[PDB]
Design a protein around this ligand. Structure first.
Ligand code: FMN
Ligand code: FMN
Ligand code: TCA
Ligand code: TCA
Ligand code: K
Ligand code: K
Ligand code: K
Ligand code: K
Ligand code: MN
Ligand code: MN
Lengths: 497, 497
């Protein structure tokens, strides 16, 4: 069998054909080595590593693919892995990736198709035959509090009433032979659904975790699509085809047919266990910071022959926690603003900001017609975004006018630094949900779960009134066209590079 | 001849030997073309252009050297032009450049030596023989309000009492055949001295403007060394040799003997004229924003045979306004903090911030012994720096701990973004002098000359108490040494770049 965006195995082959894979066929240790290689790949934008000979792999469990959604070295196909998740050309721009991820938002869902089997059923291990401590689960960072099996798989949970089935990524580590512990925190949909089952109080939550799912599905799993929306039908609509699912053996949830590895079991409504610390998206680990997390019981494993586990070695720039979490949040915030009648054209979370900022490009013609002010406009934008789930992970919003390409961090930093007067041009939001994972939040001076947010207005005064009143002091804007072309045409004759 | 740091002509030759020069011997227009080529060089870190055939050059006035203090493409000799100003190896780090610029601060001055002639006296034009509108003065940006002769020369003014002779860079444009207009603004030393002469009220200020001075001298001219300190003696001390000066023909000021071009005349204590707009350091020009500036009368020109005028085409990254203004201010702020008993080890103005921020590296062992808090420490640092001239051009200070290399913008941005909680971890300063050239100041929503400053504390809580409590989630810190070296040693065997 199938296309790369619909089948993870095909996706691996696509990375190979792209000359974007390195297959490592000698033995590699899942204790730190695989993740160290992965981390270095992410820091240097190298090819994705496929570990075909992992120390501890037994009976087909498992190979690892690192850096599945990380950056390539070239400018021209920078985002090519992300484009391979989506059937887009590998030279796709981030605007085009994010528009593809948003395209299903005003389409009818395409619900999924149930099929009686698939590759994910090629092998199975019951509750007497596996031990999660005996699989080659990686230790990703040297201070991690456990072996994090789950960095890039898909949790599947369903509302008690059956009407919403959510797919999302949330980390989890091995607790013991048949349990994991993981993050399940508000306002995430796995948490929202968990709360529904705990209020009902009758049973633990039926659960599955599918690794190596269809790449289109893992991207939606990382996106804050709306409350109540079933990701399978959104992915269906986005890709134009109904996803094929197979029922779990031990519960009534449905998993992608071509999933590499499937865990089936339950998410407890009563039990917790030690979880963390972990080397997280903002670039840190706090050794010894263990806290109680949600507890999962695993009842069954099913898997493809020669199964491959994807793994994100996350931390400092650049990995999936930046390219997918930040960009996909930004996409959804762009739509959210437009649906609130705000004149936002584009949004992106600058990597430079460790994806804690989102830059919002403003249609200043529309803003002018509003006949508003910075104070009022900043307040309106921050109230929309920081009161919504899509804004959770974002602590600063930077408003910029039409001359700025929000997908270019250098230009966002320029505009922030030169057009937003500290204090006066900003509004602080202390009574909104904060993201505790940011070190200044959970390890900072104030409440870990509240406040610490700001809207920074990098619109100039005349952008609200009569129009931009400057030209940039750059080659593009400070010279006439004919002169610029002469200069360019004579550049190498004169002796330049 | 003489050494490059003491003779501009030799400096040009040094750039040639370095394969860091392009000599353009075909005719180039000073109306925009020279500056467009220069601007492109600055935006791309290319070789410095030497325009040997400038349209309008007559009787030896003049050639142009663009981008004299801009960046080279290579990491290894990035700051090599700056090192060629100072007799440093071309691979010098910015720490080593700034330490060289600070080294004279606790040395006896070496006063200058008067010599009876020099190259700058090879040619002269009296008050009947030159016309500044007839020289090939550049139009640097298409919207500039005049032809800016003066971007990288040295103004020379002396206190009425004779005790302080100041050298500094401040822009100036041609007003008419025998006058310039320029910026003379508080708290700059040219302004301080001008105020002394206006209070005396007896005469205009004797003045000289020397272009193509000794490179060591132009660097000190761009540095905020202390009030009352004569730059010639500081440069003497920094270079270990007494600078040779020659007296002006028409006044009693002394100019470097090897100056390429010298204007002699007066800075008016009563007259003003239109000045600006200009494409400035923060990357903008506001067309039509002309204001009254200081007025200079030119009485005489003297110049070297085959004189060369240096020119800064300034604007967006990277030019002399960033590499020299920002870095040299940062240097002086590092010293200022240390002399105020603050535990600052290093300071740099990130280019990413358009040199409007300075990151201050804190010796956190010393900070711990202080037994203080963020609120108190931020207040103490901002009061020191924002109440001083060295802090003028800087609107945000970012305090970072010992793990951050302040000379690496990516690391400053990481620490700012992840360790400083907006609002709570910052202190705003509204009753300090502001820098009006920043667009958010002079073209912003608030007072152009006051406030808009902030100290942003990117120290984590335990950096004040018991010590850093994290490890970075990066290759360097999240893996043991033996493993990292294995990975590195096997990198290209495995198939990576
Ligand atoms: C590599 C990676 C790791 C992630 N880790 C977590 C995590 O541990 N906890 C979490 O709630 N979200 C995590 N996310 C982000 C969520 O997947 C994202 O917020 C998504 O919107 C959640 O789905 P939902 O909107 O259906 O709740 C991770 C995403 C990626 C790409
Ligand atoms: C290319 C360049 C252009 C500059 N333009 C100006 C200017 O127009 N006005 C100004 O006051 N300072 C200007 N500066 C900065 C001053 O030279 C710097 O603030 C210096 O500390 C002034 O000397 P002083 O401390 O003796 O007053 C410029 C510096 C450079 C490198
Ligand atoms: O463990 C991590 O690095 C990231 C976790 C996370 C939690 C909630 C939303 C987004 C990311
Ligand atoms: O004209 C410019 O771009 C820069 C001017 C300036 C003025 C005062 C201090 C530093 C720079
Ligand atoms: K999701
Ligand atoms: K603003
Ligand atoms: K000076
Ligand atoms: K802090
Ligand atoms: Mn969801
Ligand atoms: Mn001075």
């Amino acid at each position: 069998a199938q296309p790369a965006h619909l089948c993870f195995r095909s996706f691996v082959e696509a990375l190979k054909v792209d000359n974007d894979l390195v297959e490592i066929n000698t033995p590699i240790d899942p204790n730190l080595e695989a993740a160290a290689i992965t981390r270095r790949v992410c820091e240097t934008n190298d090819k994705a590593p496929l570990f075909n000979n992992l120390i501890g792999m037994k009976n087909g469990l498992f190979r690892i693919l690192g850096a599945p959604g990380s950056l390539r070295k070239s400018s021209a196909d920078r985002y090519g892995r992300l484009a391979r998740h989506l059937a887009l050309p590998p030279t796709a721009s981030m605007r085009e990736i994010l528009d593809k991820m948003l395209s299903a938002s005003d389409m009818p869902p395409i619900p999924p198709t149930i099929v009686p089997t698939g590759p994910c059923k090629e092998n199975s291990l019951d509750d007497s035959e596996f031990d999660l401590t005996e699989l080659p689960v990686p230790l990703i960072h040297k201070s991690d509090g456990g072996k994090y099996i789950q960095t890039y798989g898909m949790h599947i949970v369903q509302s008690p009433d059956g009407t919403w089935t959510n797919w999302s990524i949330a980390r989890a580590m091995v607790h013991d032979k048949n349990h994991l512990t993981g993050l399940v925190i508000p306002p995430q949909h796995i948490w929202q659904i968990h709360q529904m089952w705990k209020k009902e109080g009758r049973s633990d939550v039926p659960w599955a975790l599918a690794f190596g799912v269809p790449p289109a599905a893992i991207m939606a799993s990382s996106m804050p699509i709306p409350d109540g929306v079933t990701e399978a039908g959104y992915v269906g609509a986005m890709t134009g085809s109904s996803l094929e699912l197979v029922k779990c053996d031990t519960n009534d949830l449905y998993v992608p047919a071509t999933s590499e590895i499937v865990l089936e079991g339950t998410l407890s409504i009563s039990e917790t266990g030690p979880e963390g610390p972990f080397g997280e998206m903002h670039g840190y680990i706090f050794p010894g910071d263990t806290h109680l997390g949600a507890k999962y019981k695993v009842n069954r494993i099913t898997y493809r022959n020669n199964a491959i586990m994807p793994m994100s070695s996350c931390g400092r720039l650049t990995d999936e926690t930046h390219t997918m979490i930040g960009s996909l949040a930004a996409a959804e915030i762009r739509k959210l603003c437009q649906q609130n009648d705000l004149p936002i054209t584009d949004a992106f979370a600058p990597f430079e900001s460790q994806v804690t900022w989102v830059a919002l490009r403003v249609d200043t013609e529309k803003l002018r017609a509003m006949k508003t002010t910075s104070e009022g406009f900043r307040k309106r934008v921050g109230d929309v975004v920081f009161n919504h789930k899509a804004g959770y992970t974002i602590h600063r919003l930077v408003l910029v006018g039409d001359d700025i390409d929000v997908y270019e961090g250098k230009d966002v930093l320029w505009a922030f630094s030169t057009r937003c007067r500290p204090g006066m041009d900003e509004t602080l939001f202390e009574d909104v949900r904060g993201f505790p994972l940011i070190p200044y939040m959970g390890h900072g001076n104030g409440p870990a779960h509240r406040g610490g947010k700001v809207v920074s207005d990098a619109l100039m005064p005349t952008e609200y009134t009569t129009g931009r009143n400057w030209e940039a002091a750059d080659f593009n804007q400070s010279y006439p066209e004919d002169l610029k072309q002469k200069v360019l045409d004579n550049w190498t004759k004169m002796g330049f590079s």
